[PDB]
């Protein structure tokens, strides 16, 4: 009970993937290694099944067929990311530009456009060239700013004449937190037995992301936007935080939880400074902005992409980033979960969380232009069932219907959401989860690489066509 | 403490693999489906990890590099098998001969020979054309004999001018038992919830294997052997059976255990009749041979290949099935003390001296003129989550082959004519109902990427053969 | 006045090159970066003309024609090196083996052999995978030993069936000194404005080279030598050190100079310990060997390759650094009279008799069973602005090799077992910190176009070998 006509004429309906999850060919066409190749090969124990993105889902060789499947689905746009170390195998310009790399991206872009699908490009989806991680600690050093800026400028120059949507960073919170607080993601720092400091390094990292984001955005605005007529944004992720009870302590807890996950990025981008809860609780461990950086960060984006998956209740907690917001999160109220628990135990289906998070963002940061750049659902990778059975993902269709209805509710109530992107288009590699689960609307055989549409892909096709 | 000089000059040192475990390309070059394709795709729950031989380890596309690795190892001969349905997609002749299939095998053979490696070929390693399974129940029907014979004659004609060693069947016991008694292997008959009858079908199946084997052997002997100067045999498997105590009951039990696993095949090939314990216990459920088949089965092989992995103690036993027809309880323990070091799946125990005893028993009991150890090897867990650096270092496997080779040498010195030894498998490959959860290779294979890398064991073998 | 008949029948006459100086294609066929790529691209000021090995002289694409030129010269053997990161782009095994890399080397080897030229291979000529430098400081860490060992074992396995001569390291002195004392070579540590410590790091570096060398040698001896019938050594360099006057001080100085440049490596390989002058002068800054490493280092080589260019007078000397730890002043002058004709950079002086003395000294002092002269050659200015016609006529270089060959012959007649002589370099190539401002080849190479042309010296060598 949600149709296409419930949405503005110009709203975009799309899907996406990322380089490391999809491409494979990690050691072909002269790609240099990223921190995810490293993390995955040097310490396979860190992955649920010891697997890696070596072949991933083999998109680098199979792009023509992939795009054929995108068109059969009726995709209006495809969000994809460029492997920084595929075009610049050493991260910096002095290590050289990889011509096989740029040929691939041009071939991919051109083939999308030839099928009437609009390319939308993310510069950074976690696959930092290993060269820069080694040279100076990657995003632990301010050195990352200029190198990220040359890479950005290269991309704008090389590809930008045919791309209208540029994203600097995907999920800088997940990057910073999982990579430098939990040690769950590359480069695997900050947890028990790991090399960093979870009280220091997560804050250094996002500080540097924010400065790097800013440089790419100026670069684009000053030297490419007028010519190429596109826009650059960033994509942020958040859970919705619902107060457990209605006491003040729990409403304050919600403020903090939101502040630390989303405000960490969104506030600098609105007033040129961190949330005040962060400033007050984190003190000297939170870096300051120079007057000039502060000022230039204000409104430094053309849109905010939003990634949403679930919501959690929230109350008052009884050194690390993970404990700095003084907030206990739980998925239950009185032994009753906030929404149906999916495989894994983390993702609960709470469609109304998307509504609330979209309104909250508008009300709190007054963002001119929003998108839902990632929305989707986790399914167990059951070996031992047929494709005929695995295909029938009724639950995923329902999931997308319910979430779309929440997006529409938000548009009707005044939030400028301009598009919705299913994540992921394909079953692909799942970072620390390897290949034990599936997010796609297109089934992919994790060994053979055979592609087959799931029932949800057929619903999406019908939905877009309305 | 075993070297090459301990073995006769002409002894062959080799390794092997089989079509379905290695080739991949199940739906390329116009291959017809086999019962192993069917089994694994229609019933993935029957496989430990739901996997299949669809890509296997991609030998069909990677053969030039594979043979390069064989030569780096010093392999003197490689044992491989022809996928019946890769050359005849419908099993029968009327369904047509597949040219892409025959070109592959020709390219594989020529490539072996160009590298000084002797091709030795098995016609049937379990991958029966699905067409034949469906038309008449495969080996459940006497119709299998003529079609197997055409298939054999075709191979002898097409390839036999360059191959000196033909095998008809690999492990007919495992095929008939796992396939028609336990329902663990294709076609998945005979167990709880399955389609056949474990009291009937296992015996009908090997009766027809023996009769099919016989036709292929006559075909070769009468029409190809003089020209091509090769030999055909069959390859059998057994565990060694040790009496648990020394009481009569246990010695009789060992005779039964051996009779039902090995005598099932070897006795028809010796006196043209089944072991006497079988005739007496199985009665009307064991088919008889015609006078003429009986006589022609006698000595109807040029060699017996022997596949050995482990030994088990054996004692008197306490739903009608082949599995319980020999009245023998098998156990790996004496007084809580295992017969030898237990390996990964809990089944294979390392008992080198079992090979010695099994070889001596075979000679003594069936007086087989020519023996080979066609499969000898050890099971290693597929540990995901360790580096190649670590998985490579298979000291245990090197030890395993050294100890077993010593046993083979012991047997030769004692008068049994063993004429060669083949490591199984050369490569990590698909492992039937266990899928990809373990490894048997001396060459490491990444089960996704297909990248090959030599294990330390492969380097020991290289040195051993060179002595 | 020296001919082929002056040398034993089996003496080898050859030439050589190294991966980074010749191959080019630094970012093709999936090669991973080396510390020489890094050094030259991150710090072009450190190079005489800001140049690099990016294209080098394009040997990687032009090998078929290169080998044609080797055969026209009559080369009996070619010494080349494998780019560690061309075969293992991340240095370690976990980062994966690069198939395009191994195919290249296979094609290079096969092509040499098809032209009657014996491949002889160096595992390490300075181009350490950048990955390894970054993960743990390269040779600054004992972690280098195991990774070098895997790399060696991989090469022995992959290529060793067709190569009879393996070298572990080329010029470990030059590597450790230029790289960690002067900061002149990658990784550019130890000099003014640089990152390391010239008193500490040079000694840590060669300690680990010796230990890495040792592991590769055991690997070969234990697992490959019997099969492949080859030999592994190391290649050392020295100047000859002549006492300036005949006073004691100067004879002691020569002992020190030789000890610190050559004894640094040869003594551990002889008695399993460093020269005594080193132990006494360097004290706690010279690492010790474990009892077990000490013993295994003794005679841990099949041959010593010797690289010689020049000689220097030597006297007693008048910031803590390896360079000043031997208390030896070096000078090329006696009484304003140079030790021999000064060549292009002001460093290499032509002193043929220095080769004789250095070879005799090596025998007398370390009793090395087998020697080779693995690098001998002369430096010529890269004059832009003259025609090929003129640059071709390198009479001086012909003279140079004639005089040095006479010295080698003198040494053989005097009892030192020199078993071969290799002109360095075969081609004009990249010259490390000097870039492309000079030439060492007997084959002219245009440093832009890559066009090859034989020099007169190449024609003399052709005739000399043919005698």
mmCIF file of C-alpha atoms in Angstrom, chain A residues 37-265:
data_model
loop_
_atom_site.group_PDB
_atom_site.id
_atom_site.type_symbol
_atom_site.label_atom_id
_atom_site.label_comp_id
_atom_site.label_asym_id
_atom_site.label_seq_id
_atom_site.Cartn_x
_atom_site.Cartn_y
_atom_site.Cartn_z
ATOM 1 C CA UNK A 37 43.046 -6.274 1.378
ATOM 2 C CA UNK A 38 45.597 -6.015 4.197
ATOM 3 C CA UNK A 39 43.195 -6.488 7.124
ATOM 4 C CA UNK A 40 41.582 -9.426 5.394
ATOM 5 C CA UNK A 41 44.776 -11.238 4.335
ATOM 6 C CA UNK A 42 47.064 -10.398 7.303
ATOM 7 C CA UNK A 43 44.345 -11.296 9.858
ATOM 8 C CA UNK A 44 41.560 -13.520 8.483
ATOM 9 C CA UNK A 45 40.524 -14.451 12.078
ATOM 10 C CA UNK A 46 39.012 -10.948 12.195
ATOM 11 C CA UNK A 47 36.482 -12.024 9.513
ATOM 12 C CA UNK A 48 33.558 -14.304 10.428
ATOM 13 C CA UNK A 49 34.587 -16.943 7.816
ATOM 14 C CA UNK A 50 38.197 -15.934 7.054
ATOM 15 C CA UNK A 51 37.083 -14.713 3.645
ATOM 16 C CA UNK A 52 38.208 -11.604 1.701
ATOM 17 C CA UNK A 53 37.436 -9.263 -1.184
ATOM 18 C CA UNK A 54 40.011 -10.925 -3.441
ATOM 19 C CA UNK A 55 37.379 -11.902 -6.018
ATOM 20 C CA UNK A 56 34.520 -10.350 -4.052
ATOM 21 C CA UNK A 57 31.616 -10.719 -6.471
ATOM 22 C CA UNK A 58 33.730 -10.175 -9.600
ATOM 23 C CA UNK A 59 32.041 -6.937 -10.762
ATOM 24 C CA UNK A 60 35.272 -5.673 -12.383
ATOM 25 C CA UNK A 61 34.994 -8.323 -15.105
ATOM 26 C CA UNK A 62 31.236 -8.626 -15.160
ATOM 27 C CA UNK A 63 30.173 -4.947 -15.421
ATOM 28 C CA UNK A 64 28.364 -5.218 -18.814
ATOM 29 C CA UNK A 65 26.067 -7.975 -17.501
ATOM 30 C CA UNK A 66 25.663 -6.132 -14.161
ATOM 31 C CA UNK A 67 24.400 -3.026 -15.910
ATOM 32 C CA UNK A 68 22.088 -5.154 -18.060
ATOM 33 C CA UNK A 69 20.566 -6.388 -14.727
ATOM 34 C CA UNK A 70 20.333 -2.810 -13.393
ATOM 35 C CA UNK A 71 18.266 -1.869 -16.492
ATOM 36 C CA UNK A 72 16.068 -4.955 -16.188
ATOM 37 C CA UNK A 73 15.350 -3.764 -12.628
ATOM 38 C CA UNK A 74 14.561 -0.229 -13.949
ATOM 39 C CA UNK A 75 17.259 1.411 -11.835
ATOM 40 C CA UNK A 76 17.307 5.174 -12.507
ATOM 41 C CA UNK A 77 20.688 5.647 -10.950
ATOM 42 C CA UNK A 78 23.498 3.469 -9.558
ATOM 43 C CA UNK A 79 25.633 4.526 -6.599
ATOM 44 C CA UNK A 80 29.130 3.070 -6.846
ATOM 45 C CA UNK A 81 32.546 3.894 -5.383
ATOM 46 C CA UNK A 82 35.980 4.298 -6.900
ATOM 47 C CA UNK A 83 38.825 2.251 -5.425
ATOM 48 C CA UNK A 84 41.323 4.994 -4.596
ATOM 49 C CA UNK A 85 44.170 2.526 -4.930
ATOM 50 C CA UNK A 86 42.828 1.204 -8.255
ATOM 51 C CA UNK A 87 43.441 4.600 -9.892
ATOM 52 C CA UNK A 88 46.330 5.712 -7.693
ATOM 53 C CA UNK A 89 48.085 2.470 -6.602
ATOM 54 C CA UNK A 90 50.217 4.350 -4.046
ATOM 55 C CA UNK A 91 47.590 6.846 -2.856
ATOM 56 C CA UNK A 92 49.842 9.843 -3.678
ATOM 57 C CA UNK A 93 50.388 11.260 -7.178
ATOM 58 C CA UNK A 94 54.181 10.565 -7.174
ATOM 59 C CA UNK A 95 53.561 6.802 -7.124
ATOM 60 C CA UNK A 96 51.693 7.342 -10.431
ATOM 61 C CA UNK A 97 48.330 7.057 -12.137
ATOM 62 C CA UNK A 98 47.125 3.600 -13.149
ATOM 63 C CA UNK A 99 45.777 3.705 -16.704
ATOM 64 C CA UNK A 100 44.041 0.303 -16.461
ATOM 65 C CA UNK A 101 42.210 1.673 -13.451
ATOM 66 C CA UNK A 102 40.871 4.787 -15.147
ATOM 67 C CA UNK A 103 39.946 2.820 -18.231
ATOM 68 C CA UNK A 104 37.752 0.581 -16.062
ATOM 69 C CA UNK A 105 35.902 3.504 -14.459
ATOM 70 C CA UNK A 106 35.368 5.268 -17.810
ATOM 71 C CA UNK A 107 34.085 1.984 -19.291
ATOM 72 C CA UNK A 108 31.762 1.578 -16.285
ATOM 73 C CA UNK A 109 30.482 5.161 -16.389
ATOM 74 C CA UNK A 110 29.996 5.108 -20.205
ATOM 75 C CA UNK A 111 28.145 1.767 -20.022
ATOM 76 C CA UNK A 112 25.786 3.061 -17.304
ATOM 77 C CA UNK A 113 24.936 6.109 -19.370
ATOM 78 C CA UNK A 114 24.451 3.960 -22.463
ATOM 79 C CA UNK A 115 21.727 2.154 -20.491
ATOM 80 C CA UNK A 116 20.020 5.326 -19.227
ATOM 81 C CA UNK A 117 21.311 4.834 -15.662
ATOM 82 C CA UNK A 118 22.798 7.874 -13.930
ATOM 83 C CA UNK A 119 26.243 7.301 -12.400
ATOM 84 C CA UNK A 120 26.568 8.515 -8.808
ATOM 85 C CA UNK A 121 30.117 8.311 -7.383
ATOM 86 C CA UNK A 122 31.630 7.860 -3.911
ATOM 87 C CA UNK A 123 35.336 8.740 -3.677
ATOM 88 C CA UNK A 124 35.941 6.993 -0.337
ATOM 89 C CA UNK A 125 34.214 3.818 0.837
ATOM 90 C CA UNK A 126 36.845 2.639 3.418
ATOM 91 C CA UNK A 127 39.410 1.205 0.977
ATOM 92 C CA UNK A 128 42.264 3.581 1.784
ATOM 93 C CA UNK A 129 45.387 2.783 -0.240
ATOM 94 C CA UNK A 130 47.642 0.726 2.009
ATOM 95 C CA UNK A 131 50.563 2.934 0.882
ATOM 96 C CA UNK A 132 49.151 5.915 2.817
ATOM 97 C CA UNK A 133 48.192 3.867 5.897
ATOM 98 C CA UNK A 134 51.848 2.831 6.019
ATOM 99 C CA UNK A 135 53.461 6.163 5.092
ATOM 100 C CA UNK A 136 51.798 8.192 7.818
ATOM 101 C CA UNK A 137 48.985 6.262 9.549
ATOM 102 C CA UNK A 138 46.269 7.212 7.039
ATOM 103 C CA UNK A 139 43.560 9.349 8.661
ATOM 104 C CA UNK A 140 45.585 9.515 11.912
ATOM 105 C CA UNK A 141 47.619 12.230 10.166
ATOM 106 C CA UNK A 142 46.644 15.643 8.796
ATOM 107 C CA UNK A 143 48.727 14.590 5.764
ATOM 108 C CA UNK A 144 45.629 12.710 4.525
ATOM 109 C CA UNK A 145 43.941 16.055 3.659
ATOM 110 C CA UNK A 146 46.139 17.085 0.645
ATOM 111 C CA UNK A 147 46.394 13.525 -0.744
ATOM 112 C CA UNK A 148 42.650 13.038 -0.526
ATOM 113 C CA UNK A 149 42.352 16.420 -2.276
ATOM 114 C CA UNK A 150 44.616 15.475 -5.245
ATOM 115 C CA UNK A 151 42.671 12.218 -5.579
ATOM 116 C CA UNK A 152 39.364 14.095 -5.525
ATOM 117 C CA UNK A 153 40.614 16.659 -8.075
ATOM 118 C CA UNK A 154 41.904 13.872 -10.298
ATOM 119 C CA UNK A 155 38.526 12.157 -10.251
ATOM 120 C CA UNK A 156 36.617 15.429 -10.932
ATOM 121 C CA UNK A 157 38.864 16.107 -13.868
ATOM 122 C CA UNK A 158 38.936 12.572 -15.235
ATOM 123 C CA UNK A 159 35.306 11.519 -14.809
ATOM 124 C CA UNK A 160 33.386 14.594 -13.742
ATOM 125 C CA UNK A 161 32.208 15.661 -17.196
ATOM 126 C CA UNK A 162 29.682 12.816 -16.991
ATOM 127 C CA UNK A 163 28.866 12.618 -13.356
ATOM 128 C CA UNK A 164 26.297 14.834 -11.580
ATOM 129 C CA UNK A 165 26.540 13.328 -8.038
ATOM 130 C CA UNK A 166 29.728 13.120 -6.028
ATOM 131 C CA UNK A 167 30.039 11.767 -2.493
ATOM 132 C CA UNK A 168 33.262 12.383 -0.507
ATOM 133 C CA UNK A 169 32.918 9.884 2.345
ATOM 134 C CA UNK A 170 30.557 6.999 2.990
ATOM 135 C CA UNK A 171 29.803 6.426 6.694
ATOM 136 C CA UNK A 172 32.743 8.241 8.339
ATOM 137 C CA UNK A 173 31.269 7.187 11.753
ATOM 138 C CA UNK A 174 31.412 3.479 10.920
ATOM 139 C CA UNK A 175 34.923 3.957 9.525
ATOM 140 C CA UNK A 176 36.191 5.787 12.604
ATOM 141 C CA UNK A 177 34.386 3.671 15.207
ATOM 142 C CA UNK A 178 34.830 0.182 13.803
ATOM 143 C CA UNK A 179 38.383 0.854 12.612
ATOM 144 C CA UNK A 180 39.722 2.783 15.649
ATOM 145 C CA UNK A 181 37.498 2.006 18.636
ATOM 146 C CA UNK A 182 36.311 -1.566 18.167
ATOM 147 C CA UNK A 183 39.107 -2.929 15.960
ATOM 148 C CA UNK A 184 36.414 -4.724 13.987
ATOM 149 C CA UNK A 185 37.191 -3.091 10.619
ATOM 150 C CA UNK A 186 40.431 -2.124 8.815
ATOM 151 C CA UNK A 187 42.883 -1.114 10.039
ATOM 152 C CA UNK A 188 41.788 -3.118 13.102
ATOM 153 C CA UNK A 189 42.767 -0.700 15.863
ATOM 154 C CA UNK A 190 41.455 0.113 19.309
ATOM 155 C CA UNK A 191 40.023 -3.142 20.694
ATOM 156 C CA UNK A 192 41.330 -5.741 23.138
ATOM 157 C CA UNK A 193 44.706 -6.971 21.846
ATOM 158 C CA UNK A 194 44.871 -4.287 19.091
ATOM 159 C CA UNK A 195 47.423 -1.503 18.475
ATOM 160 C CA UNK A 196 45.699 1.902 18.963
ATOM 161 C CA UNK A 197 43.838 3.899 21.630
ATOM 162 C CA UNK A 198 39.993 3.877 21.488
ATOM 163 C CA UNK A 199 39.877 7.093 23.578
ATOM 164 C CA UNK A 200 42.035 9.098 21.152
ATOM 165 C CA UNK A 201 42.211 7.748 17.637
ATOM 166 C CA UNK A 202 38.489 7.705 16.682
ATOM 167 C CA UNK A 203 38.380 11.497 17.354
ATOM 168 C CA UNK A 204 41.616 12.192 15.429
ATOM 169 C CA UNK A 205 40.278 10.221 12.479
ATOM 170 C CA UNK A 206 36.925 11.952 12.030
ATOM 171 C CA UNK A 207 38.597 15.309 12.592
ATOM 172 C CA UNK A 208 40.803 14.518 9.605
ATOM 173 C CA UNK A 209 37.887 13.118 7.577
ATOM 174 C CA UNK A 210 35.975 16.357 8.136
ATOM 175 C CA UNK A 211 38.962 18.411 6.977
ATOM 176 C CA UNK A 212 39.474 16.090 4.010
ATOM 177 C CA UNK A 213 35.784 16.192 3.101
ATOM 178 C CA UNK A 214 35.985 19.984 3.243
ATOM 179 C CA UNK A 215 38.950 20.240 0.910
ATOM 180 C CA UNK A 216 37.246 17.998 -1.717
ATOM 181 C CA UNK A 217 34.074 20.092 -1.477
ATOM 182 C CA UNK A 218 35.914 23.421 -2.022
ATOM 183 C CA UNK A 219 37.916 21.831 -4.856
ATOM 184 C CA UNK A 220 34.626 20.809 -6.474
ATOM 185 C CA UNK A 221 32.709 24.072 -5.812
ATOM 186 C CA UNK A 222 35.623 26.322 -6.904
ATOM 187 C CA UNK A 223 36.929 24.463 -9.948
ATOM 188 C CA UNK A 224 34.363 21.909 -11.189
ATOM 189 C CA UNK A 225 30.722 22.616 -10.135
ATOM 190 C CA UNK A 226 30.017 25.442 -12.613
ATOM 191 C CA UNK A 227 31.392 23.361 -15.547
ATOM 192 C CA UNK A 228 30.040 19.932 -14.714
ATOM 193 C CA UNK A 229 26.733 21.067 -13.128
ATOM 194 C CA UNK A 230 26.778 18.411 -10.378
ATOM 195 C CA UNK A 231 26.856 18.340 -6.596
ATOM 196 C CA UNK A 232 29.074 16.879 -3.839
ATOM 197 C CA UNK A 233 27.752 15.679 -0.508
ATOM 198 C CA UNK A 234 28.675 13.269 2.265
ATOM 199 C CA UNK A 235 26.783 10.211 3.490
ATOM 200 C CA UNK A 236 26.110 9.722 7.169
ATOM 201 C CA UNK A 237 24.670 6.842 9.110
ATOM 202 C CA UNK A 238 22.571 6.735 12.217
ATOM 203 C CA UNK A 239 20.290 4.472 14.103
ATOM 204 C CA UNK A 240 17.177 6.113 15.426
ATOM 205 C CA UNK A 241 17.406 6.605 19.184
ATOM 206 C CA UNK A 242 14.088 6.297 21.042
ATOM 207 C CA UNK A 243 13.913 7.193 24.737
ATOM 208 C CA UNK A 244 13.343 3.960 26.691
ATOM 209 C CA UNK A 245 11.001 5.627 29.149
ATOM 210 C CA UNK A 246 9.712 9.236 29.043
ATOM 211 C CA UNK A 247 11.818 10.496 32.012
ATOM 212 C CA UNK A 248 14.185 13.443 31.287
ATOM 213 C CA UNK A 249 17.286 11.284 31.775
ATOM 214 C CA UNK A 250 16.194 9.228 28.696
ATOM 215 C CA UNK A 251 15.415 12.282 26.519
ATOM 216 C CA UNK A 252 18.841 13.688 27.418
ATOM 217 C CA UNK A 253 20.334 10.257 26.631
ATOM 218 C CA UNK A 254 18.708 10.417 23.154
ATOM 219 C CA UNK A 255 20.246 13.841 22.543
ATOM 220 C CA UNK A 256 23.681 12.473 23.416
ATOM 221 C CA UNK A 257 23.363 9.249 21.440
ATOM 222 C CA UNK A 258 22.305 11.227 18.346
ATOM 223 C CA UNK A 259 25.016 13.827 19.034
ATOM 224 C CA UNK A 260 27.793 11.216 19.126
ATOM 225 C CA UNK A 261 26.711 9.176 16.112
ATOM 226 C CA UNK A 262 25.358 11.882 13.774
ATOM 227 C CA UNK A 263 26.050 15.297 15.327
ATOM 228 C CA UNK A 264 29.760 14.392 15.384
ATOM 229 C CA UNK A 265 29.655 15.103 11.648
#
